Design a binder for this molecule. Structure first.
Ligand SMILES: [Zn+2]
Length: 391
């Protein structure tokens, strides 16, 4: 069994989502605002006897063989800006989320407010709220923090989310109750985002012992089967004759895996290791990150220019003036994230909330796809908005 759902771990970087990720998965969560997906799988098990919920093969409170229920995957990003961009670009394919809020600090913390805004923009309503560090602080601090949380979420998409003061048993239960696997169409056209790519060969391996490059796929919809012939949109730049266009990569799925679990099929949920026929040099060090995979001839069109509808984000994280709200202008150079792809671009025409943008790098996307927008707000790139492709 692979992961059936993607769950975002959000909230201020110091409120506790990082340790919480480790406890449920045994995984240590770890020049432009790139898309860098962080995945962490958690197998929810239960004990027939005591009914305790756990990730352990044998019971925590009765050493009995637990039973498998469902596998889930948590999604995180290196930092705040990156996580926000990863959600607004559609790269994260969230079905639900866990918003971690510390009790020892005011509540609304900027980052915390901003993450909720991304959840709302994304229409993600399967939320579980965790009031961490209740151990610290006293009975008035808590209860005051609790009311701040209820206030902060009032009027938002998380107004009815369970508030859980934090134990592994209670959280796993809640994940199962409040974030159920969504209904998906088994026959939807197979499409996939390449979030990572690698060369799994160690130094000095013999040529006849070399293995096809491996892809780190985030399946958007449909089912991919081992043996499927696939096509890799944007491909690579080639110079034949007097041209230099972008040529698609065609290869075959040699294997599929959910972490270390072997699969024959693979659908949306978690990061899927896709073994291919591609020579290792084409995949090494995420060379192909931001690409789109699908069955031959079924991939969305390649765009070198685009028209988007953009919304300015009402940010609270940042200094002053840096917090200003500035509309897109003609001639501006932006940094865009669409899918798991990242590319610079310049505005050839700003007409209100609409802009024609010429990209430095080709993109494979459908009309209606999401876009994360950033601008050099000083000595670094800063996320200023989000939108969709309408042309
Ligand atoms: Zn038990």
């Amino acid at each position: 069994s692979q992961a059936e759902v993607n769950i975002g771990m959000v909230g201020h970087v110091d409120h506790g989502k990082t340790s919480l990720t480790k406890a449920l998965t045994g995984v240590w969560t770890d020049r432009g605002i790139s898309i860098r997906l962080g995945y962490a799988d958690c197998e929810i098990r239960k004990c027939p006897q005591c009914g305790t919920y756990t990730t352990k093969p044998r019971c925590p409170n009765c050493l009995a063989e637990t039973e498998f229920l469902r596998r889930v995957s948590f999604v995180d990003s290196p930092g705040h800006e990156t996580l926000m961009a990863t959600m607004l670009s559609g790269a994260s394919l969230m079905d639900g989320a866990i918003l971690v809020i510390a009790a020892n600090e005011p509540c609304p913390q900027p980052q915390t407010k901003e993450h909720l805004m991304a959840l709302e923009i994304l229409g993600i309503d399967k939320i579980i709220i965790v009031q961490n560090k209740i151990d610290l602080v006293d009975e008035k601090q808590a209860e005051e923090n609790y009311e701040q949380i209820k206030e902060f979420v009032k009027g938002t998409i998380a107004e009815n989310a369970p508030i859980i003061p934090i134990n592994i048993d209670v959280l796993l239960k809640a994940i199962q109750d409040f974030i159920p696997t969504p209904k998906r169409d088994p026959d939807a056209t197979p499409r996939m985002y390449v979030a990572r790519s690698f060369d799994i060969n160690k130094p000095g391996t013999e040529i006849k012992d070399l293995k096809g490059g491996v892809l780190g796929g985030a399946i958007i919809q449909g089912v991919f089967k081992v043996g499927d012939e696939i096509e890799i949109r944007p491909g690579i730049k080639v110079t034949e004759g007097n041209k230099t266009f972008w040529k698609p990569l065609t290869t075959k799925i040699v294997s599929l895996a959910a972490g270390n679990t072997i699969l024959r099929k693979a659908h949306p949920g978690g990061l899927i290791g896709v073994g291919t026929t591609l020579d290792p040099y084409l995949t090494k060090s995420d060379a192909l990150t931001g690409s789109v995979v699908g069955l031959p001839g079924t991939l969305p069109p390649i765009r070198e220019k685009i028209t988007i509808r953009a919304n300015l984000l009402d940010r609270v994280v940042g200094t002053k003036e840096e917090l200003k709200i500035e509309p897109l202008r003609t001639g501006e150079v932006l940094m865009l994230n669409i899918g798991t792809a990242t590319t610079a671009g310049v505005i050839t025409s700003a007409r209100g909330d609409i802009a024609d943008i010429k990209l430095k790098l080709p993109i494979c996307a459908e009309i209606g796809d999401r876009v994360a927008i950033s601008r050099r707000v000083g000595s670094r790139w800063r996320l200023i908005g989000y939108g969709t492709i309408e042309g």
